[PDB]
Every structure is written in C-alpha cells, then in structure tokens.
Amino acid sequence: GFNKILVVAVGNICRSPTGERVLQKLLPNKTVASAGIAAEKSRLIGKPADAMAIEVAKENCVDVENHQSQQLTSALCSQYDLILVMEKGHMEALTQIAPEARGKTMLFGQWIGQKDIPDPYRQSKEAFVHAYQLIDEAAQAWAKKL
C-alpha cells in the first residue's frame, strides 16, 4: 500500500508544497511530504512556500505555512512509498538521482489527462490560481485511489 507520499517538482516552493498540503488534507490517513529536484542548486533549501502560493491555498482553506523547501535525494526517496511529480520530464531527472525509485514514481496529474502542471514561479496570481486548480483537481482524483 501507498502510505507515505512524496510530491516532487523543481524548487519545492510553489507546486510541490501546494500539492503536498492539498493531498494531505484529502488523505489524513497518509503522510505527505514534498521535495525539489533542483532546490539546492536554486539556493532555495529552507525557504518557505512562495507567498502567492500560500495565499491562493489559504483562500481554499489549505494551509501551506511552515513549509521548508528540501532537496530530492536517493535517501529521501527510500522513505516514501509513492512519488508524484508535477511534470512528466521530472521522472527522468528524478531517476538520475534515484534510479531505484522509477517503479514508484507517477504523475501528479495522471487522472486529469496525464497533464503536466506548469510552474507559476515569478508570474502573476493568475498563474498561481491556474496551478492550484490543476493541483486540486488532480489531488481529488488521487485521493479516491490511495
């Protein structure tokens, strides 16, 4: 069974913390965390979720406060049963870091047409609203299957 879920993207400040907390609210019987493939190179480790990501989630009663961006590592992947990436291209970048994690890595937006969810970083609130919408729809579908 998939009990520990890791939501993965690039910076671990916008989509992946949002997906973590949206999914955590829908799946209180699971442990959900998140990480970024390039959090360290982006100089983001320890940073909170983007303020606009927090605000958009808060308007939907999802708490993205007290987040700290962390880097995706092979050791981290071993702690989770299921990994959900925001873009299909993230899978190959992830398996470069943790080739053993291929089998448990799936797409966050699998159930909404296997769609990528684009990064809203450094764009207007509209982009964060769009990202939240896709994350919400995608997470609702995952919650019924885990």
Residue numbers in the entry: 1 to 146
List sentences from the manuscript.
The process requires the protein tyrosine kinase Wzc and its cognate phosphatase Wzb, both of which are largely uncharacterized. VvWzb belongs to the low-molecular-weight protein tyrosine phosphatase (LMWPTP) family. Interestingly, it contains an extra four-residue insertion in the W-loop, distinct from all known LMWPTPs.
However, only phosphate ions were identified in VvWzbC9A structure, judged by the unambiguous electron density. The source of the phosphate ion was not defined, presumably from benzylphosphonate degradation or contamination. VvWzbC9A-phosphate shares a similar active site structure with the VvWzb-benzylphosphonate complex. As a result, the hydrogen bonds between the phosphate ion and the P-loop residues are generally shorter than those observed in VvWzb-benzylphosphonate, suggesting a stronger binding. Overall, the structure of VvWzbC9A-phosphate mimics that of the phosphoryl-enzyme intermediate, judged by the position and orientation of the phosphate ion. This water molecule is assumed to be activated by Asp119 and functions as a nucleophile in the dephosphorylation reaction of the phosphoryl-enzyme intermediate. The phosphate ion does not interact directly with the D- and W-loop residues; however, the conformations of these loops are similar to those observed in VvWzb-benzylphosphonate complex, suggesting that the phosphate ion alone is sufficient to induce the conformational changes of the D- and W-loops.
